[PDB]
Design an enzyme around this catalytic site. Structure first.
Site, PDB file in Angstrom:
ATOM      1  N   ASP A  25       0.812  -1.218   0.000  1.00  0.00           N
ATOM      2  CA  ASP A  25       0.000   0.000   0.000  1.00  0.00           C
ATOM      3  C   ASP A  25       0.848   1.272   0.000  1.00  0.00           C
ATOM      4  O   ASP A  25       1.383   1.694   1.034  1.00  0.00           O
ATOM      5  CB  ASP A  25      -0.830  -0.063   1.256  1.00  0.00           C
ATOM      6  CG  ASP A  25      -1.885   0.986   1.248  1.00  0.00           C
ATOM      7  OD1 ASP A  25      -1.852   1.861   0.318  1.00  0.00           O
ATOM      8  OD2 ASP A  25      -2.776   1.004   2.108  1.00  0.00           O
ATOM      9  N   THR A  26       0.956   1.888  -1.178  1.00  0.00           N
ATOM     10  CA  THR A  26       1.747   3.112  -1.306  1.00  0.00           C
ATOM     11  C   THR A  26       1.088   4.269  -0.561  1.00  0.00           C
ATOM     12  O   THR A  26       1.784   5.261  -0.330  1.00  0.00           O
ATOM     13  CB  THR A  26       1.942   3.505  -2.770  1.00  0.00           C
ATOM     14  OG1 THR A  26       0.664   3.676  -3.397  1.00  0.00           O
ATOM     15  CG2 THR A  26       2.683   2.400  -3.527  1.00  0.00           C
ATOM     16  N   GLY A  27      -0.188   4.163  -0.215  1.00  0.00           N
ATOM     17  CA  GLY A  27      -0.866   5.253   0.504  1.00  0.00           C
ATOM     18  C   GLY A  27      -0.683   5.161   2.012  1.00  0.00           C
ATOM     19  O   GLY A  27      -1.176   6.042   2.740  1.00  0.00           O
TER      20      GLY A  27
HETATM   21  C1  LIG Z   1       0.436   5.880   9.578  1.00  0.00           C
HETATM   22  O1  LIG Z   1       0.313   4.670   8.860  1.00  0.00           O
HETATM   23  C2  LIG Z   1      -0.923   4.521   8.303  1.00  0.00           C
HETATM   24  C3  LIG Z   1      -1.136   3.374   7.572  1.00  0.00           C
HETATM   25  C4  LIG Z   1      -2.305   3.129   6.874  1.00  0.00           C
HETATM   26  C5  LIG Z   1      -3.317   4.074   6.943  1.00  0.00           C
HETATM   27  S1  LIG Z   1      -4.822   3.795   6.054  1.00  0.00           S
HETATM   28  O2  LIG Z   1      -5.032   2.327   5.947  1.00  0.00           O
HETATM   29  O3  LIG Z   1      -5.882   4.581   6.684  1.00  0.00           O
HETATM   30  N1  LIG Z   1      -4.546   4.409   4.532  1.00  0.00           N
HETATM   31  C6  LIG Z   1      -4.234   5.803   4.471  1.00  0.00           C
HETATM   32  C7  LIG Z   1      -4.930   6.626   3.338  1.00  0.00           C
HETATM   33  C8  LIG Z   1      -6.421   6.733   3.617  1.00  0.00           C
HETATM   34  C9  LIG Z   1      -4.306   8.037   3.362  1.00  0.00           C
HETATM   35  C10 LIG Z   1      -4.041   3.454   3.548  1.00  0.00           C
HETATM   36  C11 LIG Z   1      -5.112   3.229   2.443  1.00  0.00           C
HETATM   37  O4  LIG Z   1      -4.427   2.629   1.308  1.00  0.00           O
HETATM   38  C12 LIG Z   1      -6.257   2.317   2.932  1.00  0.00           C
HETATM   39  C13 LIG Z   1      -5.822   0.853   3.158  1.00  0.00           C
HETATM   40  C14 LIG Z   1      -7.020   0.022   3.655  1.00  0.00           C
HETATM   41  C15 LIG Z   1      -7.543  -0.942   2.800  1.00  0.00           C
HETATM   42  C16 LIG Z   1      -8.696  -1.650   3.205  1.00  0.00           C
HETATM   43  C17 LIG Z   1      -9.297  -1.378   4.445  1.00  0.00           C
HETATM   44  C18 LIG Z   1      -8.696  -0.461   5.332  1.00  0.00           C
HETATM   45  C19 LIG Z   1      -7.565   0.263   4.913  1.00  0.00           C
HETATM   46  N2  LIG Z   1      -7.357   2.292   1.943  1.00  0.00           N
HETATM   47  C20 LIG Z   1      -8.456   3.052   2.082  1.00  0.00           C
HETATM   48  O5  LIG Z   1      -8.719   3.877   2.887  1.00  0.00           O
HETATM   49  C21 LIG Z   1      -9.533   2.834   1.000  1.00  0.00           C
HETATM   50  C22 LIG Z   1     -10.116   3.902   0.328  1.00  0.00           C
HETATM   51  C23 LIG Z   1     -11.071   3.674  -0.668  1.00  0.00           C
HETATM   52  C24 LIG Z   1     -11.474   2.387  -0.992  1.00  0.00           C
HETATM   53  C25 LIG Z   1     -10.910   1.333  -0.268  1.00  0.00           C
HETATM   54  C26 LIG Z   1     -11.194  -0.124  -0.630  1.00  0.00           C
HETATM   55  O6  LIG Z   1     -10.922  -0.493  -1.768  1.00  0.00           O
HETATM   56  N3  LIG Z   1     -11.450  -1.015   0.297  1.00  0.00           N
HETATM   57  C27 LIG Z   1     -12.083  -0.732   1.568  1.00  0.00           C
HETATM   58  C28 LIG Z   1     -12.544  -2.074   2.110  1.00  0.00           C
HETATM   59  C29 LIG Z   1     -12.621  -2.989   0.908  1.00  0.00           C
HETATM   60  C30 LIG Z   1     -11.626  -2.420  -0.098  1.00  0.00           C
HETATM   61  C31 LIG Z   1     -10.300  -3.120  -0.056  1.00  0.00           C
HETATM   62  N4  LIG Z   1      -9.946  -4.259   0.469  1.00  0.00           N
HETATM   63  C32 LIG Z   1      -8.664  -4.601   0.414  1.00  0.00           C
HETATM   64  C33 LIG Z   1      -8.222  -6.013   0.837  1.00  0.00           C
HETATM   65  C34 LIG Z   1      -7.846  -3.803  -0.262  1.00  0.00           C
HETATM   66  S2  LIG Z   1      -8.840  -2.432  -0.703  1.00  0.00           S
HETATM   67  C35 LIG Z   1      -9.897   1.534   0.682  1.00  0.00           C
HETATM   68  C36 LIG Z   1      -3.161   5.178   7.770  1.00  0.00           C
HETATM   69  C37 LIG Z   1      -1.943   5.455   8.432  1.00  0.00           C
END
Ligand SMILES: COc1ccc(S(=O)(=O)N(CC(C)C)C[C@@H](O)[C@H](Cc2ccccc2)NC(=O)c2cccc(C(=O)N3CCC[C@@H]3c3nc(C)cs3)c2)cc1
Ligand SMILES: [Cl-]
Ligand SMILES: [Cl-]
Ligand SMILES: [Cl-]
Ligand code: NA
Lengths: 99, 99
Positions: A25-27
């Site tokens: 996860d690059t984000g």
């Molecule tokens: C300080 O270190 C940190 C590390 C991670 C985070 S974070 O997880 O909140 N995040 C930061 C960004 C919002 C700035 C990383 C981001 O890549 C997250 C990673 C993450 C994935 C799945 C569930 C929880 C976190 N994705 C989303 O917010 C995000 C945004 C829009 C859509 C989706 C999405 O595609 N999801 C949500 C649930 C189902 C689906 C996914 N499932 C998986 C398995 C991958 S994506 C995710 C915050 C601080």
């Protein structure tokens, strides 16, 4: 390898003696793993994303093997819905985004 | 370009004639932008991030430039800590992860 983004970039990792699946996860600034025990000291931390913040345990100097490549760094452990490999460890395996 | 991950992979986007900063985010399926005005109708969507679920407005077929590359696709508008470009538009600009 070159990983396509047509699908979620999931890989196998080894951490704490355990195999897990995790998202490259690059984000994510930091690496966040679902609840597990890790050896040594830790301190509490809050990290925030969509939906708000969660409390995690910060362990430093933890070795992970990521798709066969070893890296060492900080790992956060807490109630994340997905295991996330963040930039602190992606850099160590030489991961880049290319387009 | 080849983007390393020692720093956040922030790029300039252009949407609605406006330049904004956004994070290239391989851990997001979808693109999520902070509150702004977009044309056309929207549909409801829930996304579940690290801290819980949020409601967003889904706009389809929106023209957006990302790091100089043209994309046309779905943009979610809602309360995100930073604008994120997810895989739906990373695929349109030809991005891959490599290590
Ligand atoms: C300080 O270190 C940190 C590390 C991670 C985070 S974070 O997880 O909140 N995040 C930061 C960004 C919002 C700035 C990383 C981001 O890549 C997250 C990673 C993450 C994935 C799945 C569930 C929880 C976190 N994705 C989303 O917010 C995000 C945004 C829009 C859509 C989706 C999405 O595609 N999801 C949500 C649930 C189902 C689906 C996914 N499932 C998986 C398995 C991958 S994506 C995710 C915050 C601080
Ligand atoms: Cl680290
Ligand atoms: Cl490097
Ligand atoms: Cl799309
Ligand atoms: Na330690």
């Amino acid at each position: 390898p070159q990983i396509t983004l047509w699908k979620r970039p999931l890989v196998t990792i080894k951490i704490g003696g355990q195999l897990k699946e995790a998202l490259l996860d690059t984000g994510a600034d930091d690496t966040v793993i679902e609840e597990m025990s890790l050896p040594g000291r830790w301190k509490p931390k809050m990290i925030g994303g969509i939906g708000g913040f969660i409390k995690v345990r910060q362990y430093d100097q933890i070795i992970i093997e990521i798709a066969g490549h070893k890296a060492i760094g900080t790992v956060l452990v807490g109630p994340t819905p997905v295991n996330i490999i963040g930039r602190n460890l992606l850099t160590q395996i030489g991961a880049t985004l290319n387009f």
